[PDB]
Swiss-Prot record, chain A:
Part of the full-length chain shown: 309 to 547 of 595
Every NR LBD domain range: 3-233
Signal peptide (UniProt feature, chain positions): none
Cited function: Nuclear hormone receptor. The steroid hormones and their receptors are involved in the regulation of eukaryotic gene expression and affect cellular proliferation and differentiation in target tissues. Ligand-dependent nuclear transactivation involves either direct homodimer binding to a palindromic estrogen response element (ERE) sequence or association with other DNA-binding transcription factors, such as AP-1/c-Jun, c-Fos, ATF-2, Sp1 and Sp3, to mediate ERE-independent signaling.
Cellular localization per UniProt: Nucleus; Golgi apparatus; Cell membrane
Name of the protein in its database record: Estrogen receptor
Annotated phenotype, changing residue 225 to A: Abolishes interaction with NCOA1, NCOA2 and NCOA3
PTMs per UniProt: Phosphorylated by cyclin A/CDK2 and CK1. Phosphorylation probably enhances transcriptional activity. Self-association induces phosphorylation. Phosphorylated by LMTK3 in vitro. Glycosylated; contains N-acetylglucosamine, probably O-linked.
Protein residues bound to 17beta-estradiol: 43, 84, 210
Distribution of this protein across tissues and organs: Widely expressed. Not expressed in the pituitary gland.
Effect of residue 65 to H: In ESTRR; results in highly reduced activity
Other noteworthy facts: Selective estrogen receptor modulators (SERMs), such as tamoxifen, raloxifene, toremifene, lasofoxifene, clomifene, femarelle and ormeloxifene, have tissue selective agonistic and antagonistic effects on the estrogen receptor (ER). They interfere with the ER association with coactivators or corepressors, mainly involving the AF-2 domain.
Consequence recorded when altering residue 76 to C: Loss of transmembrane localization, no effect on peripheral membrane localization. Impairs activation of estrogen-induced activation of NOS3 and production of nitric oxide. No effect on binding to ERES
Organism in which the protein naturally occurs: Homo sapiens (Human)
Curated annotation (Swiss-Prot), chain B:
Domain notes: Composed of three domains: a modulating N-terminal domain, a DNA-binding domain and a C-terminal ligand-binding domain. The modulating domain, also known as A/B or AF-1 domain has a ligand-independent transactivation function. The C-terminus contains a ligand-dependent transactivation domain, also known as E/F or AF-2 domain which overlaps with the ligand binding domain. AF-1 and AF-2 activate transcription independently and synergistically and act in a promoter- and cell-specific manner. AF-1 seems to provide the major transactivation function in differentiated cells.
Residue numbers of Phosphotyrosine PTMs: 226
Name used for this protein in its record: Estrogen receptor
Effect of residue 77 to C: Loss of transmembrane localization, no effect on peripheral membrane localization. Impairs activation of estrogen-induced activation of NOS3 and production of nitric oxide. No effect on binding to ERES
NR LBD domain span: 5-234
Tissue/organ expression: Widely expressed. Not expressed in the pituitary gland.
Effect noted on mutating residue 85 to H: In ESTRR; highly decreased estrogen receptor activity
Source organism of the structure: Homo sapiens
Miscellaneous comment text of the record: Selective estrogen receptor modulators (SERMs), such as tamoxifen, raloxifene, toremifene, lasofoxifene, clomifene, femarelle and ormeloxifene, have tissue selective agonistic and antagonistic effects on the estrogen receptor (ER). They interfere with the ER association with coactivators or corepressors, mainly involving the AF-2 domain.
Function: Nuclear hormone receptor. The steroid hormones and their receptors are involved in the regulation of eukaryotic gene expression and affect cellular proliferation and differentiation in target tissues. Ligand-dependent nuclear transactivation involves either direct homodimer binding to a palindromic estrogen response element (ERE) sequence or association with other DNA-binding transcription factors, such as AP-1/c-Jun, c-Fos, ATF-2, Sp1 and Sp3, to mediate ERE-independent signaling.
Region (Self-association): 1-234
Gene this protein is translated from: ESR1
Disease as annotated in the protein's UniProt record: Estrogen resistance: A disorder characterized by partial or complete resistance to estrogens, in the presence of elevated estrogen serum levels. Clinical features include absence of the pubertal growth spurt, delayed bone maturation, unfused epiphyses, reduced bone mineral density, osteoporosis, continued growth into adulthood and very tall adult stature. Glucose intolerance, hyperinsulinemia and lipid abnormalities may also be present.
Length: 233, 234
């Protein structure tokens, strides 16, 4: 129902803050997973607030909202990381007080590290804009779990998600058209942006693989935990 | 290769299409699932290599970069093919014309039922979208070129990446042309382009789940090595 410009402003308004990591005591590479886990768990609370502010998301059932977040949360964390690392070549800006390069990633993730750095590089080359970024993040939330939900309710939920996804596509095209791009450039850029999302899913899968391999009780946010965070009064 | 028309690009991809293979099993014999699928895939991979070489722009790359792209994309390519020929068979996966299974038949293998349902959902989405053959071959070409392009600073590799992105742009223009030829409005054009490309994210996910299982098997030959792929390409 909203216009493209109304859509962008809504997404920009809903943006989560950049959080910080740790005492200015000596640094050690052993505590790296500790720092990143603490940060992530903290961001995830804010991500829930952001999601409820993505247009169309709260129109879904509580169950489907959880399913979408369950599928997308690490992808969302990762595109956020890649975004704030964009203007810091060769480094990943996990937090403003936690900026690491390749060699420091070797602490058992250097594979994922290199993949994130390459995505940052790609964003840099494409001159990715903030307005485009918030659209892509919204798309990840809506798309990542939409294929893994019969009932009439489900069919209506799926149709709604696809209609919102169509709206974000229109918004992306409008941003490019505002920027002065030709129709050919618009289509080509849209495609370039969406193809990156495949790589972000890949990195998320690799990351989730490690998280499950840790064999710890809450390393992956449970359905029940996500439900409680979403199901607010 | 970067000078073809949209129609020339399409006819090139359609002519390059690999054949549908059959499962190897005695049909007179009683009703091994992983054994059947592994044999099918291995035979399919040989034809996939011939196909890759006829994708415009691919052979312009170094043999090293060709192997890397195929390394990243081969199971994705097998899966989108599986989804495509399963499209007109709701609730079933058509692994081969003599091997059509439903939901409960994937339970024979650990974790397969998860993948099974994800594949069925993709075929359903394809059917809903009324995906066209010409669109399909474009999507499969995109998978080949895009999946490995993010995994360099050497002048040559900068040239290689540049080339891959120019080819991907050409396929994008081709997709748009197909849709414009079918009378879609500009809005419906870019909306459909987005819908199709977003499905490729789910296909990556399914490949990753599948790769996790193949690796979980402690077999030396199950995952095709760089050398094996280089032998086949070169
Ligand atoms: C790439 C960094 C990422 C972490 C991360 C990414 C982005 C960001 O903004 C913050 C952190 C990461 C690490 C741990 C983690 O699991 C903790 C989750 N809770 C839910 C138990 C999540 C992300 C990571 C994921 C898997 C393995 C190693 C590292
Ligand atoms: C989803 C079916 C797929 C098989 C398949 C995919 C596409 C196709 O057209 C036909 C069958 C499959 C299974 C194993 C496999 O690896 C074999 C090892 N070779 C590659 C050395 C490839 C495909 C599969 C992948 C992982 C585990 C179980 C099944």
């Amino acid at each position: 129902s909203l216009t493209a410009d109304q859509m962008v402003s809504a997404l920009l308004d809903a943006e989560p803050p950049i959080l910080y990591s740790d005492p200015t005591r000596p640094f050690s590479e052993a505590s790296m997973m500790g720092l990143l886990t603490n940060l992530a768990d903290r961001e995830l609370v804010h991500m829930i607030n952001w999601a409820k502010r993505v247009p169309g998301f709260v129109d879904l059932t509580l169950h489907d909202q959880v399913h979408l977040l369950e599928s997308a949360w690490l992808e969302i964390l990762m595109i956020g990381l890649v975004w704030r690392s964009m203007e810091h070549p060769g480094k990943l800006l996990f937090a403003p007080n936690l900026l690491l390069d390749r060699n420091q990633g070797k602490s058992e993730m250097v594979e994922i590290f290199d993949m994130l750095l390459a995505t940052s590089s790609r964003f840099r080359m494409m001159n990715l804009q903030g307005e485009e970024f918030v659209c892509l993040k919204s798309i990840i939330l809506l798309n990542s779990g939409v294929y893994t939900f019969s009932t009439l309710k489900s069919l209506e939920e799926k149709d709604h998600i696809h209609r919102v996804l169509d709206k974000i596509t229109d918004t992306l095209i409008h941003l490019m058209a505002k920027a002065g791009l030709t129709l050919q450039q618009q289509h080509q850029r849209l495609a370039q942006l969406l193809l990156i999302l495949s790589h972000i899913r890949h990195m998320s899968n690799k990351g989730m693989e490690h998280l499950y391999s840790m064999k710890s009780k809450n390393v992956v946010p449970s359905y029940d935990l996500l439900l409680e965070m979403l199901d607010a009064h």
